[PDB]
Amino acid sequence: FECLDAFFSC
């Protein structure tokens, strides 16, 4: 989920 967080918050 951290990977997603970083990607979507990018």
Next chain:
Amino acid sequence: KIGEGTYGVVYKARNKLTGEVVALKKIIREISLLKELNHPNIVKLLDVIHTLYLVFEFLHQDLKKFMDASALTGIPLPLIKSYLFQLLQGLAFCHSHRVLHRDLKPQNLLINTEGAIKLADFGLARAFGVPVRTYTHEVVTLWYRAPEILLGCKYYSTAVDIWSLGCIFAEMVTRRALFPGDSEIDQLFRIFRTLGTQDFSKVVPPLDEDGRSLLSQMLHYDPNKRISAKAALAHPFFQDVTKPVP
């Protein structure tokens, strides 16, 4: 707006009341019966009108843009397993209903913040068939097409989709394309140069033995011997992904 998906252009010009917020795409009518399909890993078709307009559930960001952003950082193996598991769920659901995509690629694999991944542009491989490069201005990615369609074998089956889901699989592990061909003949040459040595050791190094087994079973050149979504879901690769229902 932004959007250019496989067969037409997707955007959002109108909206209609109640904060509808959809994706609307401009491009027999048995795609009207795709509205009756419901699965968490399928982008739901809300409505369809011929004058034709498709109206899909709006999800921005697709597996391609995610893999592009995750090019140098890579993708966690549990997330790769979860995406492959969900895509296999969607493919099993679609194939049990005799519905093919016939042209999967990462641009029609939509993702949300919850972590779900959904198959889009599905079951419409009859509205102008499957794309092919007839003119020099056209692009058409062949990197994910099964060898039977690449040759020109007229009989397509569910085994093509698996093949695509195989390539994408390897991609998620390497965020390098497995068979990056620039013509039909070059695509077949790359495919059969790779498959004809094949445990997938050097081509997908970071993938463990269960993953390489599942990949080689998903990438059988013979479509009749290619693994199905049902059998692939029961693979030991998904031993730590499977969880009871309640």
